[PDB]
Amino acid sequence: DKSKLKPGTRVALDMTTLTIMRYLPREVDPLVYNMSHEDPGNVSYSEIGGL
């Protein structure tokens, strides 16, 4: 699908002959993946008071 390789996209290459094998989606940089949803904390507005 050579019409879908827009300038900006992220692709995978070949090592030996160095050709394009597969288009990829974006990357999500695992510092931010381990920043998103690692909190199972379950505090609520009942626990805060005074403000």
Partner 1 sequence: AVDTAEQVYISSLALLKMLKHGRAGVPMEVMGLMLGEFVDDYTVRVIDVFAMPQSGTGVSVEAVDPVFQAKMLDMLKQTGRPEMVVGWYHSHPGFGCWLSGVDINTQQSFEALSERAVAVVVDPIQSVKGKVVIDAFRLINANMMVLGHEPRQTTSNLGHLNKPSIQALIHGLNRHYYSITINYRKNELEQKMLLNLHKKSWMEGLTLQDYSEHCKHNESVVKEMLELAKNYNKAVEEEDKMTPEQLAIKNVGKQDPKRHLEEHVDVLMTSNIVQCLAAMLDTVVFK
DSSP lists the bridge partners of residue 22 as 12
Instruction: Report, in Å, the least distance between residue 7 CB and partner 1.
Output: 22
Q: How many CA atoms lie within 13 A of 18 on its CB side?
A: 0
34 binds partner 1 (CB under 8 A): no
Q: Which stretch binds partner 1 (CB under 8 A): 9-17, 25-33, 37-45?
A: 9-17
Which of 1, 14, 27, 38: binder of partner 1 (CB under 8 A)? 14
Is position 49 annotated in a ligand binding site?
Answer: yes
Cα–Cα distance for residue pair 31/7, rounded to 1 Å? 26
